[PDB]
Symmetry: C3
Subunit: 198 residues, 3 copies
């Protein structure tokens, strides 16, 4: 009718929070490390230490460990909890927790509001996703190319345009450019969504 | 009056988010490991590895550790962050962070939207809670029996019907059936609420 | 016009959740350990074990570690995830992830609803913040004095009244009183906000 009652607001809020709590976007993530996914270390850009100027000019904390490629499969995305590689090109290969037909990926970066100077120049920009249908993964099939938009929302999801029904258990994230940081690109979290067996 | 103003929506939203941030439900958890609770390892079903078909058929990651019973006392409930035991019956015994009179427990499971095929057949179903008033815990008193509803909300709270005023520092969660998974039952997080001393 | 439409509620809710997800308050934290900050161990009150009465009267779990001063630079603030020192006075010195001009700090404590008896008597109360412009930090300049209000919201932010433009990379949090706990004061998370270089 006219406007909205206090009661329907409560319902809209409760539902929005329930969606928020389903890993924000409500899609199963077959790349999530705790769900059984892993990175193929041997098939990943070399890790770049972003905290150099502090690891030298102040020390190596005793509990301190470099952010490795598995970090992209981990949901903590507080500032710094990103895997960094050198320069604007890099890739990681992920073995998914199940064989799936892939329909979408998600990439997120730390929000501008939480970065120095509100810029995120080390965020990835253009990237592509490849599926490897065999384990002895030499030949990649392009599943899609996309751009992470630095003026968009921190979490962005990308739907493959008309996928085949091919299924895959190993996928690569291949970063083609960044948002212009001259030293490295930082990846906060990469997710892979699709349809499993049965 | 007629409808709701932009201003009262902001207030409803702010309050809902403040409640959301108080561990979702706003009740102290005496089973929370970081608050000083622990599991009595010796008094727990044997742990079942759910990631077998991958731990074999791909490898044992080097950082990898089996999900043990303490995981049920830990708030991270991303997919996979659950303690699994074999078959549909299992139990864990928890030593609470303080001696309390118990009034409710909470059990949660990963949401359907985040599971393969939107089913959660390994969620617990019927279960019971027992208090042990002594440390040399051989004899359990039934505090209540309940069913975790797989079509309900991911977090469910269960109030004991008219508790005595008996106080306890050791409680058991005893799972009686699951939602029909033929190999194991997975527990994401178990909480115990009640009234302390003073 | 008259009231608010279902549609504008959805928009208000979506925005509130996006703000919620930017570390709740939307300001970069230069004290965040994962962002490259650290505590100067050597310049910190001695750590106090709050779980004594259980670490003795039940045991030392095998995975168990005392909550150390770095915990105040870590975003997990579930109950127990606080650094405790003895009595109501204490301090920690933080080396920030970048040299900044400081404009605000944030201090938070666990919410009353999640504590035994709804009281948080171990929360800090009056405190001060000092900047040390040199590394060989002997002389502190008072940046501001404030009170954490135990009847206020769990997260509280404090703006310095007309800061100089002086920049700092090392700051101290100095707690002057607590809310009356006779044995210790517990710090959940301390954040430092300000303007960086460029
Ligand atoms: K991450
Ligand atoms: K858990
Ligand atoms: K903390």
């Amino acid at each position: 009718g006219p406007g909205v009652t206090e009661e329907q607001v409560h319902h809209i809020v409760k539902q929005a929070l329930q969606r928020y709590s389903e890993d924000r976007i409500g899609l199963a993530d077959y790349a999530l490390e705790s769900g059984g996914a892993s990175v193929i270390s041997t098939r990943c850009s070399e890790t770049y230490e972003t905290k150099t100027a502090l690891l030298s000019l102040f020390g190596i904390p005793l509990w301190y460990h470099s952010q490795s490629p598995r970090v992209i499969l981990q949901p903590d995305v507080h500032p710094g909890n990103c895997w960094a590689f050198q320069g604007p090109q890099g890739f990681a290969v992920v073995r998914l927790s199940a064989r799936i037909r892939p329909t979408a990926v998600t990439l997120e970066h730390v929000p501008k509001a939480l970065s120095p100077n509100s810029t995120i120049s080390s965020a990835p920009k253009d990237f592509a996703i490849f599926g490897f249908d065999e384990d002895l993964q030499q030949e990649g099939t392009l599943l899609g190319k996309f751009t992470y938009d630095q003026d968009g929302e921190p979490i962005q999801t990308f739907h493959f345009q008309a996928p085949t029904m091919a299924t895959y258990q190993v996928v690569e994230l291949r970063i083609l450019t960044n948002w212009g940081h001259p030293e490295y690109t930082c990846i906060y979290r990469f997710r892979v969504h699709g349809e499993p067996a049965h």
